[PDB]
Design a protein around this ligand. Structure first.
Ligand SMILES: *[C@@H]1O[C@H](CO)[C@@H](O[C@@H]2O[C@H](CO)[C@@H](O)[C@H](O)[C@H]2NC(C)=O)[C@H](O)[C@H]1NC(C)=O
Ligand SMILES: *[C@@H]1O[C@@H](C)[C@@H](O)[C@@H](O[C@@H]2O[C@H](CO)[C@@H](O)[C@H](O)[C@H]2O)[C@@H]1O
Ligand SMILES: *[C@H]1O[C@H](CO)[C@@H](O)[C@H](O)[C@@H]1O
Ligand SMILES: *[C@H]1O[C@H](CO)[C@@H](O)[C@H](O)[C@@H]1O
Ligand SMILES: *[C@H]1O[C@H](CO)[C@@H](O)[C@H](O)[C@@H]1O
Ligand SMILES: *[C@H]1O[C@H](CO)[C@@H](O)[C@H](O)[C@@H]1O
Ligand SMILES: *[C@H]1O[C@@H](C)[C@@H](O)[C@@H](O)[C@@H]1O
Length: 871
């Protein structure tokens, strides 16, 4: 039978327009005579099916509704608001572009707020940083602003000599964002030096460099070897798979670089690709970040505080962006020559070289052309194979291009090392230029990390904002997980970059979604891959809570690897928590009896003094200060409060105190006495009052020599008194007198004894005046006015004076003259009419008696002239 007698219908339309439908067509069979007779039913196929439109349907970015508005209390009154990427762009879908989090102007719950409570016995840099007072006036900027050193009068040097800092030491203190493979903000302070002077010596470079406190180990010895120039081969990039965990870049050897990988994945699509990598680290330093008590950076520490206590996904994640994900525990500093070469697997297979051979040809070619390798034998296996043959014997130039994974130096210079047709990169000149840059701009290389979380350990609520942080981090990485991705054409393994999913191709496949396969590639299996996690479960009676993934997404198929890991995961679950805990002076001392301390407190500083004083009627005897001992104990003098006591008065060896005591009690008297010829000038009895006497003449007291009817004017001889000679008879100077001389208009001092004696004859020429030595006084003037009365006056008195003025009267052995009232003018009074009274302010008539009685008593008037007055 001829089957095409019954012709095909048209293919139907494809059941789908993408993601691979089917279509069919069938013979147009009529059961006619010819049909039944030619066994057409037994021998003809009657239908055809085939797949169609197997191109992937493009998937467009899908964001979600926004979250609840976010309160604001920065000095920037803006409101943060977030939505997230539900579905990531794929296979040429529309990428997402309306930014994830949008902020606006805000209404403040509280006006601009700043904090002030931080430093107790610590010192406050005016920057606000709080450092150990120990670190003050020590010849070193420990504050930053050097405030801790401003006007220091003298300083305790930490370091004997000025040592210089490791240059670029800060780079080992900056944060590391794992996912993005780039260093972020300064996170450790690595200039901080604690006052402690640790140092370390460069090989063959003069003076030691100054190690900072955070570096437990620094190294300057640099090894050179072949081992250092390493090459790997990659049949495809799916190999790179090795939650971010603390690792080493010696172990992983799988680098993410913001563009690096993506370029290479994009390259891998252009055609069936294999990759040869070749790198060589170029060190200037080892270094080991000391494990605990790291000195954070200002800016980091500040920001790491303005973080709320209650969990807050939005603002926590922000630290990762700003500061990173890890921080360097150990590493080196310099640069890394690192190039991923891209080779077309058809070329390689046509070259017939094995991986080991090809890796080698790139090794020795790099060595000759880029590194300045002294000289070497040519190797025809690398030079005359079918690939190198088409490029003047270069194997490297058989590549499509190189991608640069170089770290170190300025990017301009790294980029040049990456060859492509007609470009630079296989010229020594080029390599040396980069190499310069790498000294001028090192980078941390060959380095292990640690989660940035283990750094936030000594703030107010460390343990709080620590677990607050692991949460904000888990959810951070959640956001970058490839599970969100639709699966890929041939066991391609999806990887999320930003908000789109690039397909990483298995060797033997290319095309923009790894759809095209080369004639070698055969498989048709499908390895399993986790769908996304599930949502957390309600917290249980037990801490127990739950989460769940399903090995769907690409469901495992046709003998393809079931996805490996867990379908479920259990963590436990049921405030402001501090971090765990890792001189003091003395109490008020006890006075000695009858005293008290001059300063009451509950607590004294070690080394403080307090003074002991005494109640009234007592005085301290002994050192009067107690000192606070480090002990918490008081150092005490033998001090006490003794009762007041007078001591022994001013001893002139002449006098004799009695009772003789060395100390007298308040209330007891002494009797000062002198020998027979002598008598005490002052009183004979002083008494002890409050530790002084009544009162101690301090030498103004010694025993001077102090112990008949003739009346002492004349001396006896023949039972009859006769006038004594003044220059021959007068011995013991009588009291010194002040006598006046009418004949000489002159006064002078004289001994009474002589005066007396002289009186016998000339006395009507010399008049007494004042007791004591001559000296200006009212008496003088008075004795003047007296003597002026002059002639006409007669005197019959003998007090011992013994002369008495007319108006006065001797007191009869009482020893001095007295005044009179005008009433008693018995004896005749010469007529001194003219006199001014003063009271009546007039001139009236008055006798010498009345005139005399007024000048003696009050001396309160002026005598105009003897003889009649105006009145
Ligand atoms: C850090 O660098 C130091 C050198 O500064 C390295 O110490 C050397 O280690 C090698 C072998 O590991 C020894 O042969 C040398 O004797 C060591 N030199 C000194 C001066 O110690 C050290 O290995 C490096 N550490 C890391 C992490 O690689
Ligand atoms: C047919 O034409 C294609 C180019 C796309 O426009 C298709 O849209 C997609 O259709 C598939 C059908 O399997 C849906 O699953 C996709 O979500 C839809 O975007 C169209 O059907
Ligand atoms: C269906 O198959 C083809 C159509 O492409 C025809 O050649 C054949 O004869 C039958 O009709
Ligand atoms: C089925 O449809 C195909 C195109 O999809 C044609 O090539 C064929 O001739 C038949 O009509
Ligand atoms: C889920 O994740 C694991 C690795 O953690 C894969 O092996 C699996 O295929 C899917 O990606
Ligand atoms: C499974 O999915 C969840 C959400 O993406 C993550 O928490 C986890 O890291 C894993 O990707
Ligand atoms: C080169 O040959 C290919 C086929 C593989 O066996 C590689 O491992 C080898 O290096």
């Amino acid at each position: 039978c001829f089957c095409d007698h019954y012709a095909w219908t048209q293919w139907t339309s494809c059941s789908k327009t993408c993601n691979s439908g089917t279509q069919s067509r069938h013979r147009q069979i009529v059961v006619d005579k010819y049909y039944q007779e030619n066994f057409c039913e037994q021998i003809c196929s009657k239908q055809e099916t085939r797949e169609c439109n197997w191109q992937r349907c493009p998937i467009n970015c899908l964001l979600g509704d926004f979250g609840p508005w976010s309160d604001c209390d920065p000095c920037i009154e803006k409101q943060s608001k977030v939505r997230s990427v539900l579905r990531p762009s794929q296979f040429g879908g529309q990428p997402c572009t309306a930014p994830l989090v949008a902020f606006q102007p805000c209404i403040p719950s509280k006006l601009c707020k700043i904090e002030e409570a931080d430093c107790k016995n610590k010192f406050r840099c005016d920057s606000g940083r709080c450092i150990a007072r120990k670190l003050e006036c020590n010849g070193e900027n420990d504050c930053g602003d050097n405030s801790d050193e401003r006007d220091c009068g003298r300083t305790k040097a930490v370091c004997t000599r000025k040592y210089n800092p490791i240059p670029s030491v800060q780079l080992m203190g900056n944060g590391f964002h794992f996912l993005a493979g780039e260093p972020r903000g300064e996170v450790l302070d690595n200039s901080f030096t604690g006052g402690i002077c640790k140092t370390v010596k460069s090989s063959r470079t003069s003076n030691p460099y100054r190690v900072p406190a955070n570096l437990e180990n620094v190294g300057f010895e640099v090894q050179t070897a072949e081992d250092d120039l390493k090459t790997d081969f990659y049949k495809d990039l799916t190999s790179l798979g090795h939650v971010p965990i603390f690792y080493s870049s010696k172990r992983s050897e799988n680098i993410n670089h913001n563009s690096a990988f993506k370029q290479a994945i994009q390259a891998s699509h252009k055609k069936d690709s294999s990759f040869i990598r070749i790198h060589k680290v170029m060190k200037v330093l080892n270094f080991t970040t000391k494990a605990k008590d790291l000195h954070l950076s200002d800016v980091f520490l500040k920001a790491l505080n303005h973080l709320p206590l209650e969990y807050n996904s939005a603002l926590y994640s922000r630290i990762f962006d700003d500061f990173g994900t890890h921080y360097f525990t150990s590493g080196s500093l310099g640069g890394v020559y690192d190039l991923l070469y891209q080779f077309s697997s058809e070329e390689l297979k046509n070259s017939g070289l094995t991986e080991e051979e090809a890796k080698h040809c790139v090794r020795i070619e790099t060595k000759k052309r880029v590194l300045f390798a002294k000289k070497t034998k040519v190797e025809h296996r690398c030079t005359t194979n079918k690939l190198s043959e088409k490029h003047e014997g270069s194997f490297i130039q058989g590549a499509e291009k190189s991608i640069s994974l170089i770290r170190g130096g300025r990017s301009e210079y790294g980029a040049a090392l990456a060859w492509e047709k007609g470009s630079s990169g296989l010229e020594e000149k080029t390599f040396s230029e980069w190499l310069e840059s790498v000294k001028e701009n090192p980078a941390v290389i060959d380095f292990e990390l640690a989660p940035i979380v283990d750094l936030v350990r000594n703030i107010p609520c460390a343990v709080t904002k620590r677990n607050n942080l692991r949460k904000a981090l888990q959810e951070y990485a959640a956001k970058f997980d490839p599970c969100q991705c639709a699966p890929c054409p041939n066991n391609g393994r999806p990887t999320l970059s930003g908000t789109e999913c690039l397909c990483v191709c298995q060797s033997g496949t290319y095309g923009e979604n790894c759809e095209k396969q080369s004639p070698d590639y055969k498989s048709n299996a499908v390895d399993g891959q986790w769908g996304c996690w599930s949502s957390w479960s309600t917290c249980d009676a037990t801490y127990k809570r739950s989460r769940t993934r399903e090995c769907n997404n690409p469901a495992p198929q046709r003998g393809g690897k079931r996805c490996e890991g867990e379908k479920r995961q259990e963590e436990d679950c049921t405030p402001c928590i501090n971090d765990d805990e890792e001189d003091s002076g003395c109490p008020q001392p006890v006075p000695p009896e009858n005293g008290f301390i001059r300063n009451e407190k509950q607590l004294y500083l070690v080394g403080e003094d307090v003074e002991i004083s005494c109640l009234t009627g007592f005085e301290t005897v002994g050192y009067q200060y107690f000192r606070c001992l480090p002990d918490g104990t008081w150092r005490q003098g033998d001090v006490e409060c003794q009762r007041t006591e007078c001591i022994k008065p001013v001893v002139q060896e002449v006098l004799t105190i009695t009772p003789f005591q060395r100390l007298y009690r308040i209330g007891e008297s002494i009797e000062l006495t002198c020998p027979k010829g002598f008598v005490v000038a002052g009183p004979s009895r002083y008494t002890c009052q409050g530790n002084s006497w009544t009162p101690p003449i301090s030498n103004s007291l010694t025993c001077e020599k102090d112990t008949g009817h003739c009346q002492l004017g004349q001396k006896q001889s023949g039972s009859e008194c006769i006038c004594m000679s003044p220059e021959e008879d007068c011995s013991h100077h009588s009291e010194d007198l002040c006598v006046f001389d009418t004949d000489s208009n002159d006064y002078f001092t004289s001994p009474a004894c002589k005066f007396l004696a002289e009186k016998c004859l000339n006395n009507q020429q010399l008049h007494f005046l004042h007791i004591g030595s001559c000296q200006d006084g009212r008496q003088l003037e008075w004795g003047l006015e007296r003597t002026r009365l002059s002639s006409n006056s007669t005197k019959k008195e003998s007090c011992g004076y013994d002369t008495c003025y007319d108006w006065e009267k001797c007191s009869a052995s009482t020893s001095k003259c007295v005044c009179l009232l005008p009433p008693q003018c018995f004896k005749g009074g010469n007529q001194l009419y003219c006199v001014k009274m003063g009271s009546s302010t007039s001139e009236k008539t008055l006798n010498i008696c009345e005139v005399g009685t007024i000048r003696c008593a009050n001396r309160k008037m002026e005598i105009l002239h003897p003889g009649k007055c105006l009145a």
